[PDB]
Design a protein around this ligand. Structure first.
Ligand SMILES: [Ca+2]
Length: 223
């Protein structure tokens, strides 16, 4: 997260770190057994880390649970990033508390202009690299489809939306991928892609979760 703030320990209780020996992506806990992330975050050997604040220090609220199954969306196209969503099933159920909690799936797509909370452990610089140990947060509005399409001509599908600030300076970034965009207490986006981070006229692009709710429900009901 570039231009954001320190969330505070366990103030984003659905945020997960995906770990393959190191943090590599975020995700969102959606029930005690399932995590939503980005398909471009796929790899084998995932351990889901719940109740994290500092990802390098055991602070006492962590639950480390290996993935039993990863399911990339059937129509994920890594060339275009269309359908950039995956589900991760945990080997055992998380113990839900005030600091480890699920986030609700949307019923309707979020409104443009709604201020959303985006979070993660990704790069905090738009030039150069600096990765935080504690969770960072950003508040950013959903942009209109016309501004999104203008920013990225020929690249925005109906399964994507833009959020952020056209002036630059505030954005998600590398390492935030797969993490949540929460608007009105619903998981409306997944950190997906963008052209660098926090660049003028290049807002963040996010997987439109509302388009996937039927698939998520069907998949969870059968796995
Ligand atoms: Ca920790």
């Amino acid at each position: 997260i570039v231009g954001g703030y320190t969330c505070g320990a366990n103030t984003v209780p659905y945020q997960v770190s995906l770990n393959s020996g190191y943090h590599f992506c975020g995700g969102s806990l959606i029930n005690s057994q399932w995590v939503v992330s980005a398909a471009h975050c796929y790899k084998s050997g995932i351990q889901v880390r719940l109740g994290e604040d500092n990802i390098n220090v055991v602070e006492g609220n962590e639950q480390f649970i290996s993935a039993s199954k990863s399911i990339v969306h059937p129509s994920y196209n890594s060339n275009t990033l269309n359908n950039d969503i995956m589900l991760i099933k945990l080997k055992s159920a998380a113990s839900l508390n005030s600091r480890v909690a699920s986030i609700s799936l949307p019923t309707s797509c979020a409104s443009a202009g709604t201020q959303c909370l985006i979070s993660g452990w990704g790069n905090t610089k738009s030039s150069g690299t600096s990765y935080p140990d504690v969770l960072k947060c950003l508040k950013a509005p959903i942009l209109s489809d016309s501004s999104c399409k203008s920013a990225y001509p020929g690249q925005i599908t109906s399964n994507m939306f833009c959020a952020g600030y056209l002036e630059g300076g505030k954005d998600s970034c590398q390492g935030d991928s797969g993490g949540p965009v929460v608007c009105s207490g619903k998981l409306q986006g997944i950190v997906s892609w963008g052209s660098g981070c926090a660049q003028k006229n290049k807002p963040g692009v996010y997987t439109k979760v509302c388009n996937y709710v039927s698939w998520i429900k069907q998949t969870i009901a059968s796995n």
